[PDB]
Design a protein around this ligand. Sequence first.
Ligand SMILES: *[C@H](CS(=O)(=O)c1ccccc1)[C@H](CCc1ccccc1)NC(=O)[C@H](Cc1ccccc1)NC(=O)N1CCN(C)CC1
Length: 254
Amino acid sequence: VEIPSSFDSRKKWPRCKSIATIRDQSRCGSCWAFGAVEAMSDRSCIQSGGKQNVELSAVDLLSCCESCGLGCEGGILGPAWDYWVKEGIVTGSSKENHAGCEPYPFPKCEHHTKGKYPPCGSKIYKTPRCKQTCQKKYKTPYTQDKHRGKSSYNVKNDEKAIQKEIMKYGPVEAGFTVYEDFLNYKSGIYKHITGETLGGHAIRIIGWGVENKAPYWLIANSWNEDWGENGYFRIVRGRDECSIESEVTAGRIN
Ligand SMILES: *[C@H](CS(=O)(=O)c1ccccc1)[C@H](CCc1ccccc1)NC(=O)[C@H](Cc1ccccc1)NC(=O)N1CCN(C)CC1
């Protein structure tokens, strides 16, 4: 009937391989776009009963959405999802996977931690141009590869509402405020104690649990599988921690 004390989208739809996928946005501020295309890829898979097994292109949205902000310099969550509805997004994997219509052009790197990939550093790339043509060897026309949703919406700033929204329809995108101490997160349930504000980050909430009495959101970051708890992090649920319950945005394919 109700909300379980714990839930994990990977556990309900494990056929949907995108749910368990951790991406890397590279030396680019495209978080806004990733949490969008990630939740959408999850939700297309979930909502069509499995028939929509696709990986949507972060670069299609990052570069072609004209009302979504500043590209590699930062974006708006609501319009991103609106772009998905009116205009749609083509397929595109990552750089080192080379798949789909418009795959990501930037290589994987380490975000505030030592790993396998070369360190990201602090340079930011210019927002790619809007292509409108697929990569040479993917033959489906750009305009035909567009996958659209039927609706976009903000979810209410409401713990229980966010929970039902995830369970019934899939992961949601959400923004939160980054304070300096987040850049030192390694594991555990994150809460802002110390540090100045640096900006906002958009991520994908996949579930929630409770670790000995302590409630949390399970969140997929997009700084590759090396950062945090194998890509994922956890943050205090229930108290609008860093406004994590304020900027929740999603939509549906039908
Ligand atoms: C992503 C956050 S990030 O992954 O932590 C990141 C990546 C790279 C560098 C720094 C941080 C982007 C970062 C934006 C940015 C780029 C370059 C220098 C500094 C910052 N953040 C966003 O895209 C956020 C998304 C967001 C919106 C609302 C609430 C919470 C998160 N949006 C954003 O920064 N802007 C500013 C530009 N604009 C027109 C509105 C959206």
